[PDB]
Amino acid sequence: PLSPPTNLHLEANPDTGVLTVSWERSTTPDITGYRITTTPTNGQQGNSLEEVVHADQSSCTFDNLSPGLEYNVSVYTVKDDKESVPISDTIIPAVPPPTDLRFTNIGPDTMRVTWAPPPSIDLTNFLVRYSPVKNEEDVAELSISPSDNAVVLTNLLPGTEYVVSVSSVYEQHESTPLRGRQKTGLDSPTGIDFSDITANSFTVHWIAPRATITGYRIRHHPEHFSGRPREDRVPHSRNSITLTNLTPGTEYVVSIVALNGREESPLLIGQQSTVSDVPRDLEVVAATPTSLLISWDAPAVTVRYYRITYGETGGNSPVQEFTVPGSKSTATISGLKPGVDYTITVYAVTGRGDSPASSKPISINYRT
């Protein structure tokens, strides 16, 4: 008779395909080979196969089994037309896990996770598990249709790294998890608000985002400007900035993004106009044959004094001028000449020194 093989070893590749069968050779000399068989346990529909090796060979592979199913493997010692009793053992190949984990559509509180499902297998479903890297025990689970290859996670914490794993499932059998990490984006700062508005400046305020950031990049500009908009880069400790050197009575678009390294958040945008430093409603209140009592409305800024100029309309010759204290918005222009159209101009001088900052002019032409 023939002594059967002993020390049977069954090795099924996780991603079911190759199943290596190994054994200690028979102790009977003069035999001609070994025959191996794989059959679904208890008698079921699957892939019952067979393979034959030489006497000197002690291993064969079954690179064609059905994952997550049980098989009984038997190896027989063969000598021509005779065979030994077999050495049998049963194995359930592992469920193939999915592969190719891609993260797309990354938002501050959401992300789309895609995978490549195991080929040629009718899974029961997929099992997605995810949690914050620094909050492992805070895990959530999702069962996905076996016909789907993606999951859009939602209601996530901004600027937070999450661990995401997708597992294939068949009946009870779950595969190894297809794992990967992905950080959510930064949420935008909110509640842009402006204060301390002047003729050439204003303070911008904003509310910090939930995510951890290192600073902000504020950018501002009026409707039309030649080159690159002026920007400011501040530390995360700042929640306001006073923009200076702005032009009077000008509308500015201010944008703020939170930053963290090369990471940026979406924009928080707003608009704010600077106060106009130009006087208004300049007019002639009273008048005589050689004078005009003019009046105007002070601009919403502190004027040191006003500069009034007057000269014959279209005269082209030097204008005459004098000042008025900032506290008063009235003036009398004496010694004029009748039958002489006079262009009267008023400027709000707000600066000091030898070259005081003055507003743009406002004038009228008088009918006399």
UniProtKB/Swiss-Prot annotation:
Residue ranges occupied by any Fibronectin type-III domain in the UniProt entry: 4-93, 97-189, 190-277, 278-368
Region (Cell-attachment): 95-368
Post-translational note: Sulfated. Forms covalent cross-links mediated by a transglutaminase, such as F13A or TGM2, between a glutamine and the epsilon-amino group of a lysine residue, forming homopolymers and heteropolymers (e.g. fibrinogen-fibronectin, collagen-fibronectin heteropolymers).
Glycan-linked positions: N72
Placement of sequence motif Cell attachment site: 352-354
Reported tissue expression: Expressed in the inner limiting membrane and around blood vessels in the retina (at protein level). Plasma FN (soluble dimeric form) is secreted by hepatocytes. Cellular FN (dimeric or cross-linked multimeric forms), made by fibroblasts, epithelial and other cell types, is deposited as fibrils in the extracellular matrix. Ugl-Y1, Ugl-Y2 and Ugl-Y3 are found in urine.
Subcellular location: Secreted, Extracellular space, Extracellular matrix; Secreted
Pathology linked to this chain's protein: Glomerulopathy with fibronectin deposits 2: Genetically heterogeneous autosomal dominant disorder characterized clinically by proteinuria, microscopic hematuria, and hypertension that leads to end-stage renal failure in the second to fifth decade of life. Spondylometaphyseal dysplasia, corner fracture type: An autosomal dominant form of spondylometaphyseal dysplasia, a group of short stature disorders distinguished by abnormalities in the vertebrae and the metaphyses of the tubular bones. SMDCF is characterized by flake-like, triangular, or curvilinear ossification centers at the edges of irregular metaphyses that simulate fractures. These corner fractures involve the distal tibia, the ulnar aspect of the distal radius, the proximal humerus, and the proximal femur.
Function: Fibronectins bind cell surfaces and various compounds including collagen, fibrin, heparin, DNA, and actin. Fibronectins are involved in cell adhesion, cell motility, opsonization, wound healing, and maintenance of cell shape. Involved in osteoblast compaction through the fibronectin fibrillogenesis cell-mediated matrix assembly process, essential for osteoblast mineralization. Participates in the regulation of type I collagen deposition by osteoblasts. Acts as a ligand for the LILRB4 receptor, inhibiting FCGR1A/CD64-mediated monocyte activation.
Subunit structure: Mostly heterodimers or multimers of alternatively spliced variants, connected by 2 disulfide bonds near the carboxyl ends; to a lesser extent homodimers. Interacts with FBLN1, AMBP, TNR, LGALS3BP and COL13A1. Interacts with FBLN7. Interacts with COMP. Interacts (via type III repeats 9-14) with TNFAIP6 (via CUB domain); this interaction enhances fibronectin fibril assembly. TNFAIP6 may act as a bridging molecule between FN1 and THBS1. Interacts with TNR; the interaction inhibits cell adhesion and neurite outgrowth. Interacts with FST3 and MYOC. Interacts with SVEP1. (Microbial infection) Interacts with S.aureus FnbA.
Name this polypeptide is given: Fibronectin
Gene name, Swiss-Prot/TrEMBL: FN1
